[PDB]
Amino acid sequence: SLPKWNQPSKEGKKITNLFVNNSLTHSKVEFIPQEGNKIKWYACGPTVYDAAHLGHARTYVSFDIIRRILVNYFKYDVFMVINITDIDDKIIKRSVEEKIGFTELARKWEYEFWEDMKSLNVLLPTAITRVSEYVGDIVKYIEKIIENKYAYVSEEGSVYFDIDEFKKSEKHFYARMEPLSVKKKKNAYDFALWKSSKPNEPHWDSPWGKGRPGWHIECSTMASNILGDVLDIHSGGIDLRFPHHDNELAQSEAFFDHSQWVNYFLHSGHLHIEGLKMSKSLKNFITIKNMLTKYTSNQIRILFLLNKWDNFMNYSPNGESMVQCIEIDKSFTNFFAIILMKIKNFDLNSCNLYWSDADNKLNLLFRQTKNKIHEHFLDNFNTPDALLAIQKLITEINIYMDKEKIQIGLLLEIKHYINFIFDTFGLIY
Amino acid sequence: GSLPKWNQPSKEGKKITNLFVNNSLTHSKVEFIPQEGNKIKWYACGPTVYDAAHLGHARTYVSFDIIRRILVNYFKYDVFMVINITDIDDKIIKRSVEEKIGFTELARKWEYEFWEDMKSLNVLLPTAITRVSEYVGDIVKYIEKIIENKYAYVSEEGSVYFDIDEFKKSEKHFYARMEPLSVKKKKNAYDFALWKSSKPNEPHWDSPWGKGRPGWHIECSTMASNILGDVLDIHSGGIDLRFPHHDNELAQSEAFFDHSQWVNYFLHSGHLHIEGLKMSKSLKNFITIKNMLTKYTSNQIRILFLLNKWDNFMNYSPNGESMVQCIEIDKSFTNFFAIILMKIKNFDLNSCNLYWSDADNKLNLLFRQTKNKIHEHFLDNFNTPDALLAIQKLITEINIYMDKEKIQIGLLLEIKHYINFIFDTFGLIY
Numbered sequence: 005s006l007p008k009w010n011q012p013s014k015e016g017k018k019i020t021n022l023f024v025n026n027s028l029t030h031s032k033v034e035f036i037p038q039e040g041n042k043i044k045w046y047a048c049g050p051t052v053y054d055a056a057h058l059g060h061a062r063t064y065v066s067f068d069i070i071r072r073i074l075v076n077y078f079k080y081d082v083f084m085v086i087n088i089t090d091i092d093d094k095i096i097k098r099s100v101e102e103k104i105g106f107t108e109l110a111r112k113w114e115y116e117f118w119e120d121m122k123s124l125n126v127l128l129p130t131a132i133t134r135v136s137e138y139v140g141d142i143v144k145y146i147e148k149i150i151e152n153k154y155a156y157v158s159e160e161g162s163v164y165f166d167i168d169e170f171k172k173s174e175k176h177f178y179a180r181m182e183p184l185s186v187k188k189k190k191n192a193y194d195f196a197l198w199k200s201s202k203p204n205e206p207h208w209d210s211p212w213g214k215g216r217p218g219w220h221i222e223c224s225t226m227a228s229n230i231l232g233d234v235l236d237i238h239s240g241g242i243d244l245r246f247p248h249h250d251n252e253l254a255q256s257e258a259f260f261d262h263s264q265w266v267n268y269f270l271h272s273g274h275l276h277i278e279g280l281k282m283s284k285s286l287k288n289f290i291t292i293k294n295m296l297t298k299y300t301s302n303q304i305r306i307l308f309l310l311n312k313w314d315n316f317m318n319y320s321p322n323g324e325s326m327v328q329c330i331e332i333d334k335s336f337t338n339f340f341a342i343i344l345m346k347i348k349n350f351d352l353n354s355c356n357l358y359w360s361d362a363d364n365k366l367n368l369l370f371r372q373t374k375n376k377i378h379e380h381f382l383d384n385f386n387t388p389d390a391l392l393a394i395q396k397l398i399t400e401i402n403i404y405m406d407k408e409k410i411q412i413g414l415l416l417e418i419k420h421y422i423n424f425i426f427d428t429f430g431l432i433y
Numbered sequence: 434g435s436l437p438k439w440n441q442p443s444k445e446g447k448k449i450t451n452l453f454v455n456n457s458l459t460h461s462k463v464e465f466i467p468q469e470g471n472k473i474k475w476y477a478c479g480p481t482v483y484d485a486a487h488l489g490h491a492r493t494y495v496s497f498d499i500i501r502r503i504l505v506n507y508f509k510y511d512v513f514m515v516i517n518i519t520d521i522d523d524k525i526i527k528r529s530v531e532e533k534i535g536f537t538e539l540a541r542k543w544e545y546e547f548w549e550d551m552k553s554l555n556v557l558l559p560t561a562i563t564r565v566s567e568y569v570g571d572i573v574k575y576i577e578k579i580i581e582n583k584y585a586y587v588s589e590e591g592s593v594y595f596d597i598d599e600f601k602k603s604e605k606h607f608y609a610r611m612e613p614l615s616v617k618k619k620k621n622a623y624d625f626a627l628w629k630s631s632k633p634n635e636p637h638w639d640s641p642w643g644k645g646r647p648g649w650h651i652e653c654s655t656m657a658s659n660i661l662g663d664v665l666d667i668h669s670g671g672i673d674l675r676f677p678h679h680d681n682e683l684a685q686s687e688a689f690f691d692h693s694q695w696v697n698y699f700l701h702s703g704h705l706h707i708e709g710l711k712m713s714k715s716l717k718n719f720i721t722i723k724n725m726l727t728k729y730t731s732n733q734i735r736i737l738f739l740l741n742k743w744d745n746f747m748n749y750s751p752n753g754e755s756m757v758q759c760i761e762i763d764k765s766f767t768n769f770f771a772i773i774l775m776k777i778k779n780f781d782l783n784s785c786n787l788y789w790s791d792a793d794n795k796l797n798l799l800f801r802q803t804k805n806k807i808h809e810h811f812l813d814n815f816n817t818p819d820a821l822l823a824i825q826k827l828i829t830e831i832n833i834y835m836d837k838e839k840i841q842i843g844l845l846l847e848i849k850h851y852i853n854f855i856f857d858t859f860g861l862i863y
């Protein structure tokens with residue numbers, strides 16, 4: 005009578021002993037691919053009606069880092085999909101007051117969104133799926149949900165998910181991740197898959213009449229069509245856990261008539277500003293473009309690296325939060341300057357190369373750091389502690405370069421390792 | 434039992450990739466297992482610095498550079514690599530008297546040129562460089578311990594010789610583990626000098642046994658032992674060095690530590706031949722690395738080696754016959770990057786429909802197949818020839834997809850990043 009989770013079998017799968025905080029189990033569990041070393045991942049994208057703000061940046065940069073860890077560090081094979089919500093009540097209302105038109109507006113703010121991602125060094129996904137391009141597939145998806153007796157059609161022409169029918173099934177549980185958050189309709193908790201459209205509203209043809217997709221049906225449709233019956237990872241901010249993500253699971257479970265559409269559901273914590281979530285609704289937001297007029301990409305990525313992806317974070321404006329980010333950015337910059345110049349200008353003809361005790365000591369700390377970072381990454385993508393490991397290492401390399409006789413080959417190897425980690429962080433020096 | 438036995442490392446607590454390597458100790462492909470965790474301690478015999486390096490030298494150092502890059506960059510093993518510089522040697526001594534420029538100055542000259550040649554070929558420097566001139570004191574202490582364990586004796590002239598018969602008697606010791614069939618002052622003709630009493634007009638060093646110079650092989654056991662210790666994961670070199678140089682290193686180090694296995698995996702690269710014979714200084718058939726670089730680029734030379742399995746022999750056709758294919762491959766890669774970078778830049782999100790089409794699905798399917806083919810090849814004793822071919826086939830389809838199909842920009846980025854990742858593992862630069 006309470007929801008259960010099935011862990012993937014380990015037979016035939018890439019095993020790293022990675023553990024992640026899974027919202028389906030409300031706990032840290034071992035990450036195991038559904039197939040081989042493959043990771044099918046779907047991530048909720050923006051509604052393109054306005055600029056993106058620092059809170060959006062927190063989620064997309066945090067999960068960009070995680071993706072980089074998964075691909076660049078652990079050498080998993082990741083296929084990532086992001087939707088663009090270019091049809092929405094919000095897009096419609098903003099397009100009338102601006103009088104610029106449904107599509108011109110969606111395309112404008114989609115452009116600015118990818119430009120903002122580009123500025124933060126956020127990698128593009130393998131696939132981008134616009135809702136406008138998938139309306140035909142949404143209708144076919146909805147039709148099968150009805151064919152499976154888990155959705156019904158109102159007289160106005162709307163289609164609603166039948167929660168009671170879905171629960172009835174022993175194979176299904178509704179609201180797996182937030183159980184306690186639960187005239188035309190059967191039950192008040194039923195939500196629309198297809199919304200009948202007024203003559204003055206944009207609409208699409210359907211077997212049930214002119215209408216528009218409902219709030220959650222799009223994400224289940226596109227992810228199912230591109231990634232199929234089992235997603236390894238589905239991600240988003242914690243606010244989307246209920247009702248958006250829980251409703252995605254009900255739709256996809258109802259469509260495929262199975263019990264687990266997602267193995268691992270990851271939720272980033274919110275960025276708060278003066279104790280409240282950064283939200284357009286609260287008019288407390290800092291745009292990404294505004295943030296880049298005072299701080300660089302490396303500095304902003306360091307800020308997110310310092311805050312565990314799954315915890316809440318508080319941003320103090322006026323740069324109180326960014327002081328530490330700027331100090332770390334400075335130490336990284338100067339470190340690379342010295343080690344690069346020393347590498348480039350080092351002359352072997354004049355240098356004595358005997359492997360000294362200081363060389364042995366630095367090397368030992370270097371290999372210890374590699375292990376500390378590996379354990380940190382396995383521990384739910386603990387970048388704050390991995391970043392500290394790099395800083396401690398750099399403190400000792402700095403001492404060695406200044407005083408000790410330098411083994412050039414050792415310094416090269418150290419530079420290569422730190423480049424590799426910084427590429428995993430998305431830092432660029 | 435008249436045949437050497439090999440101890441495979443335990444698998445418990447160690448990184449297992451299912452990599453297989455051609456281990457000259459077993460004369461076979463065996464699963465590679467680190468001695469400790471994911472660490473690999475690796476020692477590689479370096480050059481003798483009395484002259485220029487040639488294409489055969491290049492083949493071995495580039496081949497093992499690629500292998501090192503695969504182990505580190507692809508499989509994420511933790512590798513410590515040591516290369517010696519043989520800057521004391523009969524040849525160095527003979528040339529420095531003919532030139533009258535002086536022993537260290539001459540060795541330092543050709544050492545400089547060796548490293549400039551490696552940098553031109555994009556060969557990464559090892560973690561540790563050990564000059565013999567810097568380790569002669571340690572060489573002497575090493576010899577002392579070998580004598581204390583009764584595995585070496587001192588001639589009256591002041592030379593010190595390894596005692597093969599004493600060494601073989603031990604049940605724990607077997608002499609010539611890798612070429613069993615290749616086996617006056619001395620007890621037996623098969624004994625070899627660890628320390629040689631000093632010839633007149635030759636440089637010399639003090640020792641408890643008199644003025645002398647290290648013998649041919651003692652340096653490599655000494656430096657590898659002092660920095661890496663009693664068990665090397667990997668020891669590498671050209672196949673000609675397997676016997677007597679590498680088998681004698683094993684006898685020296687086993688005698689020093691009095692144990693049974695100093696090296697877990699011994700890798701020997703194949704020779705580069707020119708007109709059916711090994712490229713050799715003695716045969717006067719060699720092409721210098723510098724000479725080669727006036728006609729061909731680093732990428733082209735590395736592609737030449739990528740196409741030939743590291744442990745096979747390869748025949749180099751001169752006048753650029755063998756380099757024709759390499760230059761074609763390098764040009765196709767250059768054009769590929771020029772094109773894919775332009776298409777990425779010119780992509781307009783307003784301009785393009787982004788629906789995940791069946792052509793997008795087909796290219797992606799091929800892309801993931803290529804990743805697995807390349808993984809299987811790297812596990813298959815570092816089969817770069819078959820991996821390079823996999824990249825070439827993929828690039829051909831990406832070229833077709835770009836010309837006609839409506840392109841998924843994110844897919845193209847992922848593909849370009851993977852190819853950059855594989856090309857970095859190859860030491861290619863585009």
Ligand SMILES: Nc1ncnc2c1ncn2[C@@H]1O[C@H](COS(N)(=O)=O)[C@@H](O)[C@H]1O
Nearest residue numbers: 050051059060062063240241274275282
């Ligand atoms: N203050 C905040 N802190 C962290 N993440 C935040 C956020 N606000 C939204 N998201 C997240 O940003 C993404 C895009 O939001 S959307 N659907 O376009 O409004 C979603 O994953 C939200 O949870």
Ligand SMILES: Nc1ncnc2c1ncn2[C@@H]1O[C@H](COS(N)(=O)=O)[C@@H](O)[C@H]1O
Nearest residue numbers: 076420421423424427505506509510854
């Ligand atoms: N385990 C390791 N230890 C040390 N250096 C390592 C490394 N893995 C990669 N590099 C290094 O990281 C870079 C690979 O680029 S990439 N894949 O896009 O991040 C190169 O500079 C490698 O030498």
Ligand SMILES: Nc1ncnc2c1ncn2[C@@H]1O[C@H](COS(N)(=O)=O)[C@@H](O)[C@H]1O
Nearest residue numbers: 480481489490492493670671704705712
């Ligand atoms: N024709 C050839 N093909 C491939 N490898 C060759 C080679 N000649 C020498 N080496 C190799 O190049 C390295 C240089 O060492 S030394 N003692 O200075 O010559 C050794 O590992 C030789 O086996």
Ligand SMILES: [Cl-]
Nearest residue numbers: 010011012264
């Ligand atoms: Cl499952």
Ligand SMILES: [Cl-]
Nearest residue numbers: 047064067068
């Ligand atoms: Cl993302």
Ligand SMILES: [Cl-]
Nearest residue numbers: 079080081804
């Ligand atoms: Cl991979």
Ligand SMILES: [Cl-]
Nearest residue numbers: 104108109112
């Ligand atoms: Cl506009």
Ligand SMILES: [Cl-]
Nearest residue numbers: 122123125301
């Ligand atoms: Cl940037």
Ligand SMILES: [Cl-]
Nearest residue numbers: 298299300330
């Ligand atoms: Cl600044």
Ligand SMILES: [Cl-]
Nearest residue numbers: 307310325328
């Ligand atoms: Cl902070």
Ligand SMILES: [Cl-]
Nearest residue numbers: 350351354355
């Ligand atoms: Cl120097």
Ligand SMILES: [Cl-]
Nearest residue numbers: 423426432433
């Ligand atoms: Cl970097």
Ligand SMILES: [Cl-]
Nearest residue numbers: 438439440693
């Ligand atoms: Cl044995």
Ligand SMILES: [Cl-]
Nearest residue numbers: 440441442694
């Ligand atoms: Cl052993």
Ligand SMILES: [Cl-]
Nearest residue numbers: 477494497498
């Ligand atoms: Cl090498």
Ligand SMILES: [Cl-]
Nearest residue numbers: 353541542545
């Ligand atoms: Cl010089």
